[PDB]
């Protein structure tokens, strides 16, 4: 099962501050440390800190300036880190991992892409992409759909929630005047289309959204 | 505090080749190095404990070497799973550090892009806009131009592009390009083409549709 | 002996960055570190102390890391009072040494001189000497030019100048040049002038006074 | 209170031979070592060498040309450099400081500046700069006061004794035919001068001197 | 004695897979480990693994793709080195050494040359190279003998069965489609030919032949 | 592991010459080096242990020395025996390593080839094939030029040589060129003559039999 | 072994200049260090051990200081009689070692020569030989030219020449240039003139004798 | 007293082999390490080997040539260095030291220099150089004396047996057709030739001669 828990993620303002949750699962010993990893987009793994919950004791990196403050319920199994007075320097995935005190981290969360932002948040607006009956075809048929005028990132896209991954295309989005957008490729064989079935999942953590969308021909 | 080195900071090889990453310590750190995988958008995933220490779900094509201060990443015949940053950790000294990372490319046979031009939808006029999408997809190398033309003349505003990494199904590259207008401006023209133009074909690849 | 190395010599910085002084040891030192800041005039006052650890007094702004052989002062933020040499020292084995040290500037917006010319007082008079100074405060960048006039002509006998370094109040300069005469000399002349030149008008700043 | 207390000055001839006091306060332990440090003009800092009071075993700097001996008297908290033959070389700021063996110097003196010379000792003149009744003004007026005809360095300066430090200016003395000279600004708004009183006061420690001087408007 | 005793060849196919073996006499101990060496033409010595008999515990260079497995016959004195899924890259002499367990090779095997091809074995062609009558003499005669169509490598060649040595060359083989060929050279003092009899003895391992061939004048 | 560095890569030296062979690792390993000859041919052969320490068999011209990182292996005197390949090997930590090896080479006095050439023999000719062999023997230094010639027309196909790396028994080359036709090609000319050319002379030295 | 290395191998320097001989070792070896003087044609003598302690005999203008891999012999103001070679030699591990040795050199005000002829001896023209000497003394710079002249023309056979190294007594130079025939050839002229060509003044100052 | 007493001198031929001497005087310990080292001409100081007499436990240096084998006669307080088969690469003086076991050498031999020749020792020539009569004069006059056709190397030449030192150049020897050759220097106010006597002394180790030379002026 996933050993951790993260919210996909977080918007926060210029001076303000989140607090990022880390739920473990699967075997706990009191010796087990919780470490925090800082990403920010295109570039590497940074070391944060590191927490002990069977106690409270945590460290952080001195390298960097400190936005951190580690805790964790040891009842809840969670972990948790308050970065506190961000500015968009600040905006990063930040994922969580365990390490049994052995020096490695065997397991990871997917992690909390955190935005600071004045802007707000949007839902995303999803549009098929069937295409047009003067369009020929081979024994292959692309499909696609349009994510558009959301806000923050990020948003995950499946085909037929999970049964659809041969075949798949996400584009990074690209942001324009506070809204970004994408979109996703799909292409089976012509004959399996319209017949059999397919659709494009959408989810946007930061407005808690989700939503199907069936991809038809034209009228 | 331990410095790790990781050079080259981009590998390319060639599909079934073996290939190296180093991993340079700033101090001699015993065997306590351990190695990583980020796939684009993925979280990391241990590959290689303690310098050369299996892990149960890796391939036998992954192993690692070394000690003291130098330590090599190796995979025996790279595939196109294996596109990704990898990256070298110490547990030698406190604070645990990371390497920079490694990006592994894969220098795979050339291949054209499969066009796909796509009208808006009606969902989408509905609300007041209109985006028309071409997808040039799974082609190699990287490098390749879209062009639009409306009703036979080149539009250059309210395009958006984005290209992805390349891709860890086949090592080919692909790219979306977007063209944006209000319903007004889609109404008053008729033939919308999106033209590719890619090394694999003197000729460009164009695709177009009609609203009327 | 351990040889401490502190780069760069000179570190210019934007107000409100973040700012970094290096400090390399000779051979491994644990944590033994301490750096010191030292303002114009001003004794040494120790930042921080073994490395990391703050001390009461300073200010939050100011943090240490390293271990081993390399080692970094950080303030987050710099500000006017930050414009010192900031110090390394090493205790971990005999005897303690210094680092050579780094000058921390802060580039700020420019500004103009703000001239003020003063006459030679009467107590001054009466030894039989005397001195007109003029003060050019409060500008930046440091570069700046001071020209005399007597009676509309020139002069460059009796002139000396001194400069202030960069102020902890403001980031600025400042600069006194001043005119030595006799009396006798100073009694058959009836205007001085001093003259500025810098960068922040075409137009020089001019300010004078007469006897008469 | 200040912890540790020096002299401002001392003039020294080629050849001749001084002794530096370093007294101090506070928290005194038995295991405290007094170090001095040398400071030549627009240059590092510099060990010289260390003592431990309690007892009189004194270490030196190695690198350099000996010139120190270092003593105490246990009796009236006191260490002594005596600083033997010097030469223009040996000119400078030293400093004392103390730390309590565990490495570092938490707390120096204020620190001694030598000077090596065959001249001699000239208190320093001073006199007002109040402006000229041709001159106009801001919000701001700037006076002054301009001391000359001394040696050897340093002499501090302040204004009102203290209580005027916002806008204050000392300039680097020149030296010119074994004399220095230098002026100090200080701007305060026009609307308290003349009525709030101002006044610059000027120490001289190699004669002993402190003279006051008002700055008033001219006759 | 010969301490260690290696087949002179092996041949094996791409993707195939050979078991070497390294047999010992003299002084055996139980604390003594049997290593193997790879050298690749024109290249150095590789460090392969290790194995120590008197347990069957072994360990391999960490720093190359594993093609090894050692293990022992204990009661033979063998040691053996299964190379498995061989390439071309695998082509090259193995030697195996001994090391009392104080960290250097003592002792050696002669090696074992392993190629790896497509192609079949072939042995060898000799034929004399006595001198034309038309060719003039000095107070030495050269004589020759010619080895060729042959496959895989090696080939050792003597002169009267290891009597004659001063005086012989043999020169490197050349491939082309498929087979190796070379020839050696002995120069005698001319008065000793033919009367003392001169012959050249060719051994070729990989088909397990060993041919003389008596090198007569020209009828 | 330990990286074994050697320098030079080759070594030319004259007959009688001391000569000396270095090996630097990349970490302090006491004495713990190890020295090996490789002739042309040969497996390797121990000849210093323990960086200095002879062994039996070994000429005393060999001798070791060095310890920590630089480790130096040297011959009194030089000669022909010497001609080989040298490695050295470390076994003060897991795994042993072995450096990259230094040839030496003897440079001698110059000297003329020895030149004979050879009929097919009638063994050969029987099986349907003719190889002429001439033998380019025990010449200084390396570089010669072989020339076939037929019936006084130079041939260019069919033929091939090989070098012999310098002799362990006089620091000489040698080299083998030989001539494959079919017996109908051989049948149909009457001359053949291998030419050969080398610095020692300007003319070349020819050798020719006819069949008839 | 432990490798030595004194820089620079010359050190020219002032009368009465403080002075630091440099002395880096190849590892760590505490303070075991000690540091030898050798003067023209003496043996050498003991002036630091263990890198700073005195001994008996030398003057307290020399100390040295230092420790690890960094040592420094000093000498404060230099004079005359340190003309020398100055070695560094370490007893930290086995085998002992020495530095290649730097050779001080003192920069004095410029002299002229003083020169003298000498005639042959009686003694020595008896045994049927006749040599003539000039000594070129006590001169700076270094550099300088001698020349013989028999009855006005200038000869260049059978002259030898020597240099004395800087002198300890006053950092000068000294040389002899020594004119050597048989009694036959020295009999058949009458003036002998050494000619010297120096810095110091436009004009040769020259020396001769004559026989009759 | 002289602690250390060693040989000026030793001739060898190609091949041949020599013993050099260093006995010992003052505090001897059986704690005691003699040390041998060579300085080739215009070169550096080279330690060859150290031996404890109290024992007869010797080392040499690896990293040369190994020349030598030492030894002592403990009853006589003697080292002996035997150099063997030696070449013109050998030839050098060679000092002997004495170091108390912990580290540095205290007290060193004069040396040993040994000259490795076919060539024969040859007694020195010496010579006056008193000024000709048409010579004018200072305040100081240079008188000096001639050493020639010698073989080998050293001499040393002294002025009144030690008592003139102040004032005195000897040169480096010149070779030529297989003898040294060289001049000395002395320069002594004019005021006290030839009243008071002036009297080079030379000492050729070599052929143990030793001859003193008045100057008086020329007849
Ligand atoms: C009894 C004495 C033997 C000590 C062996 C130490 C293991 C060393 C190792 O290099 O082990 C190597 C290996 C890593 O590859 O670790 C492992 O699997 C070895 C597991 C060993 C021990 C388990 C951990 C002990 C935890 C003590 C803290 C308890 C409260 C928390
Ligand atoms: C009982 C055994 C435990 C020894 C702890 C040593 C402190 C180490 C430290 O890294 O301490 C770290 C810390 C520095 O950050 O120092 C501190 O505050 C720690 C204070 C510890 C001890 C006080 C000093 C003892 C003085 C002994 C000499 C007495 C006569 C003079
Ligand atoms: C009793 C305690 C003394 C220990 C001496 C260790 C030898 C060190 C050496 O540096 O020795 C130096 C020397 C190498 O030059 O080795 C040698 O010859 C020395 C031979 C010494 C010991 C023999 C090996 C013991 C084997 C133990 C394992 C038994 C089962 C297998
Ligand atoms: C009782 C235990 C104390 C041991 C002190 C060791 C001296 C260390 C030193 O760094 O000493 C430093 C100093 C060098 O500067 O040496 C010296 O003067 C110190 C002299 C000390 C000892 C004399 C030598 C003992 C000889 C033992 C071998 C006897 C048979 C031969
Ligand atoms: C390899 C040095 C040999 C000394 C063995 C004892 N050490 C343990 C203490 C470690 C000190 C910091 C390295 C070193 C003690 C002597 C100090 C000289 C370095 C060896 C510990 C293993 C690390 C060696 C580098
Ligand atoms: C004997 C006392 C042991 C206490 C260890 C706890 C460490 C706390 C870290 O800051
Ligand atoms: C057992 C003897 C201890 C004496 C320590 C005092 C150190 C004096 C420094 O020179
Ligand atoms: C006390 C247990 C000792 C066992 C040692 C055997 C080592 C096996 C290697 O993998
Ligand atoms: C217990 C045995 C001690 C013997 C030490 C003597 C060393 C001899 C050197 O080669
Ligand atoms: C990816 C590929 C091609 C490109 N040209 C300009 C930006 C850019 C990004
Ligand atoms: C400070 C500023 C400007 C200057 N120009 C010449 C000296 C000098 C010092
Ligand atoms: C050895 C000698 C000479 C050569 N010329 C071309 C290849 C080659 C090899
Ligand atoms: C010393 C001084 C000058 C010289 N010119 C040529 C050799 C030589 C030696």
């Known amino acids: 099962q996933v050993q951790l828990q993260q919210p996909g993620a977080e918007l926060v303002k210029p001076g303000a501050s989140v607090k990022l949750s880390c739920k473990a699962s699967?075997?706990?010993?009191?010796?087990?440390?919780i470490h925090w990893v800082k990403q920010r987009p295109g570039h590497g793994l940074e070391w944060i800190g590191e927490?002990?919950?069977?106690?409270?004791?945590?460290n952080y990196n001195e390298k960097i300036q400190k936005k951190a403050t580690l805790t964790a319920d040891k009842s809840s199994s969670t972990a948790f880190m308050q970065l506190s007075s961000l500015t968009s320097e600040d905006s990063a995935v930040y994922y969580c991992?365990?390490?049994?005190?052995?020096?490695?981290?065997?397991?990871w969360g997917a992690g909390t892409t955190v935005t600071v932002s004045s802007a707000k948040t949007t839902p995303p607006s999803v549009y098929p992409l069937a295409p047009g009956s003067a369009a020929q075809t081979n024994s292959m048929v692309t499909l696609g759909c349009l994510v558009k005028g959301y806000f923050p990132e990020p948003v995950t896209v499946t085909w037929n929630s999970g049964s659809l991954s041969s075949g798949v295309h996400t584009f990074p989005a690209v942001l324009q005047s506070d809204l970004y957008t994408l979109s996703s490729s799909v292409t089976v064989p012509s004959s399996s289309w319209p017949s059999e079935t397919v659709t494009c999942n959408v989810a946007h953590p930061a407005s808690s959204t989700k939503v199907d969308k069936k991809i038809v021909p034209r009228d | 505090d331990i410095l790790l080195t990781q050079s080259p900071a981009i590998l390319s090889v060639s599909p079934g080749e073996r290939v190296s990453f180093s991993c340079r310590a700033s101090?001699?750190?015993?065997?306590?190095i351990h190695w990583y995988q980020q796939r684009t958008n993925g979280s990391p995933r241990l590959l290689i404990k303690?310098?050369?220490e299996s892990i149960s779900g890796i391939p036998s094509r992954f192993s690692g070497s070394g000690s003291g201060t130098d330590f090599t990443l190796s995979i025996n015949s790279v595939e196109s799973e294996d596109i990704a940053n990898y990256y070298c950790?110490?547990?030698?000294?406190?604070?645990?550090?990371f390497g920079s990372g490694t990006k592994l490319e894969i220098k795979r046979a050339d291949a054209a892009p499969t066009v796909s031009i796509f009208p808006p939808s009606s969902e989408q006029l509905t609300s007041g806009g209109a985006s028309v999408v071409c997808f040039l997809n799974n082609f190699y190398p990287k490098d390749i131009n879209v062009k639009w033309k409306i009703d036979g003349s080149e539009r250059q505003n309210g395009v958006l592009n984005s290209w992805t990494d390349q891709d860890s199904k086949d090592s080919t590259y692909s790219m979306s390009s977007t063209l944006t207008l209000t319903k007004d401006e889609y109404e008053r023209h008729n033939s919308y083409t999106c033209e590719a133009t890619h090394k694999t074909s003197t000729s460009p690849i164009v695709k177009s549709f009609n609203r009327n | 002996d351990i040889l401490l190395t502190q780069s760069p010599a000179i570190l210019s910085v934007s107000p409100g960055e973040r700012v970094s002084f290096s400090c390399?040891?000779?051979?491994?030192?644990?944590?033994?570190?301490?750096?010191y800041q030292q303002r114009t005039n001003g004794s040494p006052r120790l930042?921080?102390?073994?490395?990391?650890?703050?001390?009461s007094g300073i200010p939050s702004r100011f943090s240490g890391s390293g271990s081993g052989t390399d080692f970094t002062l950080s303030i987050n933020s710099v500000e006017s009072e930050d414009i010192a040499n900031?110090?390394?020292?090493?205790?971990?084995?005999?005897?303690?040494?210094?680092?050579?040290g780094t000058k921390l500037e802060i580039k700020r917006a420019d500004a103009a001189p703000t001239v003020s010319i003063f006459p030679p007082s009467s107590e001054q008079l009466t030894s039989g000497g005397a001195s007109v100074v003029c003060f050019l405060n409060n500008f930046y960048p440091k570069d700046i030019n001071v020209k005399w006039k007597i009676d509309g002509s020139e002069r460059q006998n009796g002139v000396l100048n001194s400069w202030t370094d960069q102020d902890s109040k403001d980031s600025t300069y400042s600069m006194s040049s001043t005119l030595t005469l006799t009396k006798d000399e100073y009694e058959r002349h009836n205007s001085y002038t001093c003259e500025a030149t810098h960068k922040t008008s075409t137009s020089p700043i001019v300010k004078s006074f007469n006897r008469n | 209170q200040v912890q540790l207390q020096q002299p401002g000055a001392e003039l020294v001839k080629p050849g001749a031979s001084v002794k530096l006091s370093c007294?101090?306060?506070?928290?005194?332990?038995?295991?405290?070592?007094?170090?001095?440090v040398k400071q030549r003009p627009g240059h590092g800092l510099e060990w010289?060498?260390?003592?431990?009071?309690?007892?009189?075993?004194?270490?030196?700097?190695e690198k350099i040309q000996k010139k120190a001996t270092l003593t105490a008297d246990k009796s009236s908290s006191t260490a002594f450099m005596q600083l033997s033959s010097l030469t223009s070389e040996d000119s400078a700021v030293?400093?004392?400081?103390?730390?309590?063996?565990?490495?570092?110097?938490?707390?120096?003196?204020?620190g001694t500046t030598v000077t090596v010379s065959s001249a001699k000792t000239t208190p320093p003149s001073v006199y007002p700069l109040a402006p000229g009744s041709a001159a106009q003004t801001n919000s701001m007026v700037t006076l002054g006061c301009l001391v000359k005809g001394y040696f050897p360095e340093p002499v501090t300066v302040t204004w009102n004794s203290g209580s005027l430090s916002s806008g204050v200016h000392t300039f680097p003395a020149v030296l010119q035919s074994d004399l220095y000279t230098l002026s100090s600004s200080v701007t305060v708004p026009s609307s308290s001068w003349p009525s709030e009183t101002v006044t610059c006061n000027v120490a001289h420690p190699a004669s002993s001197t402190k003279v006051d001087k008002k700055i008033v408007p001219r006759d | 004695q010969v301490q260690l005793q290696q087949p002179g060849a092996e041949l094996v196919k791409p993707g195939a897979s050979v078991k070497l073996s390294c047999?010992?006499?003299?002084?055996?101990?139980?604390?003594?480990?049997?290593?193997?060496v790879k050298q690749r033409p024109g290249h150095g010595l590789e460090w392969?693994?290790?194995?120590?008999?008197?347990?069957?515990?072994?360990?391999?260079?960490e720093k190359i793709q594993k093609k090894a497995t050692l293990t022992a016959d204990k009661s033979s004195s063998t040691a053996f080195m299964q190379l498995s899924s061989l390439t071309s890259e695998d082509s090259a002499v193995?030697?195996?050494?001994?090391?009392?367990?104080?960290?250097?090779?003592?002792?050696?095997?002669?090696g074992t040359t392993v190629t790896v091809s497509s192609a079949k074995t072939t042995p060898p062609s000799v034929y004399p190279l006595a001198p034309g009558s038309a060719a003039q003499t000095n107070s030495m005669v050269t004589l020759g003998c010619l080895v060729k169509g042959y496959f895989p490598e090696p080939v050792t060649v003597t002169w009267n069965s290891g009597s004659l040595s001063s005086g012989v060359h043999t020169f490197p083989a050349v491939l082309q489609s498929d087979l190796y060929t070379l020839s050696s050279s002995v120069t005698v003092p001319s008065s000793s030919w033919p009367s003392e009899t001169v012959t050249c003895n060719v051994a070729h391992p990989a088909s397990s032949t060993k041919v003389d061939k008596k090198i007569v004048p020209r009828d | 592991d330990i990286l074994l560095t050697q320098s030079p890569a080759i070594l030319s030296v004259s007959p009688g010459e001391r000569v000396s062979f270095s090996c630097?690792?990349?970490?302090?390993?006491?004495?713990?080096?190890?020295?090996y000859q490789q002739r042309t041919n040969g497996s390797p052969r121990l000849?210093?242990?323990?960086?200095?320490?002879?062994?039996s068999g070994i000429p005393s011209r060999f001798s070791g020395s060095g310890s920590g990182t630089d480790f130096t292996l040297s011959i009194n005197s030089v000669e022909s025996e010497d001609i080989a390949n040298?490695?050295?090997?470390?076994?003060?930590?897991?795994?042993?390593?072995?450096?990259?090896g230094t040839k030496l080479e003897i440079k001698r006095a110059d000297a003329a080839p020895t030149v004979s050439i050879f009929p097919p023999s009638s063994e050969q000719l029987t099986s349907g094939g003719a190889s002429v062999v001439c033998f380019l023997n025990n010449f200084y230094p390396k570089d010669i030029n072989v020339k076939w010639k037929i019936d006084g027309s130079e041939r260019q196909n069919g033929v091939l040589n090989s070098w012999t790396d310098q002799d362990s028994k006089d620091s000489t080359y040698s080299m083998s060129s030989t001539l494959t036709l079919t017996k109908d090609e051989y049948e149909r000319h009457n001359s053949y003559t291998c030419e050969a050319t080398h610095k020692t002379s300007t003319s070349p030295i020819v050798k020719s039999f006819n069949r008839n | 072994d432990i490798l030595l290395t004194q820089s620079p191998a010359i050190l020219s320097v002032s009368p009465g200049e403080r002075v630091s001989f440099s002395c880096?070792?190849?590892?760590?070896?505490?303070?075991?260090?000690?540091?030898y003087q050798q003067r023209t044609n003496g043996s050498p003598r003991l002036?630091?051990?263990?890198?700073?302690?005195?001994?008996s005999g030398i003057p307290s203008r020399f100390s040295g200081s230092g420790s690890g891999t960094d040592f420094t012999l000093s000498i404060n103001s230099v004079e005359s009689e340190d003309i020398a070679n100055?070695?560094?030699?370490?007893?930290?591990?086995?085998?002992?070692?020495?530095?290649?040795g730097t050779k001080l050199e003192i920069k004095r005000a410029d002299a002229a020569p003083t020169v003298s002829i000498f005639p042959p001896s009686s003694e020595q023209l008896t045994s049927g030989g006749a040599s003539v000497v000039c000594f070129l003394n006590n001169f700076y710079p270094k550099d300088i030219n001698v020349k013989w002249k028999i009855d006005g023309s200038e000869r260049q056979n059978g002259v030898l020449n020597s240099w004395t190294d800087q002198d300890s007594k006053d950092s000068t130079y000294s040389m002899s240039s020594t004119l050597t025939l048989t009694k036959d050839e020295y009999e058949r002229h009458n003036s002998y003139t050494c000619e010297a060509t120096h810095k110091t003044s436009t004009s040769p100052i020259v020396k001769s004798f004559n026989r009759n | 007293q002289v602690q250390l007493q060693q040989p000026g001198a030793e001739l060898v031929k190609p091949g041949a082999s020599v013993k050099l001497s260093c006995?010992?005087?003052?505090?001897?310990?059986?704690?005691?390490?003699?040390?041998?080292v060579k300085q080739r001409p215009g070169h550096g100081l080279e330690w060859?080997?150290?031996?404890?007499?109290?024992?007869?436990?010797?080392?040499?240096?690896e990293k040369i040539q190994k020349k030598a084998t030492l030894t002592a006669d403990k009853s006589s307080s003697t080292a002996f260095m035997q150099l063997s088969s030696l070449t013109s690469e050998d030839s050098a003086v060679?000092?002997?030291?004495?170091?108390?076991?912990?580290?540095?050498?205290?007290?060193?031999?004069?040396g040993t220099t040994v000259t490795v020749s076919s060539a024969k020792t040859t007694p020195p020539s010496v010579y006056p150089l008193a000024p000709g009569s048409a010579a004018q004069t200072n305040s100081m006059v240079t008188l000096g004396c001639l050493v020639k056709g010698y073989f080998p190397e050293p001499v040393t030449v002294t002025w009144n047996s030690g008592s003139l030192s102040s004032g005195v150049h000897t040169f480096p020897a010149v070779l030529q057709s297989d003898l040294y050759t060289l001049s000395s220097s002395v320069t002594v106010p004019s005021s006290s030739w030839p009243s008071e006597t002036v009297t080079c002394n030379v000492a050729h180790p070599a052929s143990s001669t030793k001859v003193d030379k008045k100057i008086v002026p020329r007849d």
């Open positions: 927490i002990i919950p069977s106690y409270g004791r945590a």
């Open positions: 699967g075997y706990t010993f009191t010796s087990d440390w």
């Open positions: 991992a365990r390490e049994r005190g052995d020096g490695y981290f065997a397991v």
């Open positions: 950790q110490q547990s030698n000294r406190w604070p645990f550090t």
């Open positions: 303690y310098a050369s």
């Open positions: 101090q001699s750190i015993g065997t306590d």
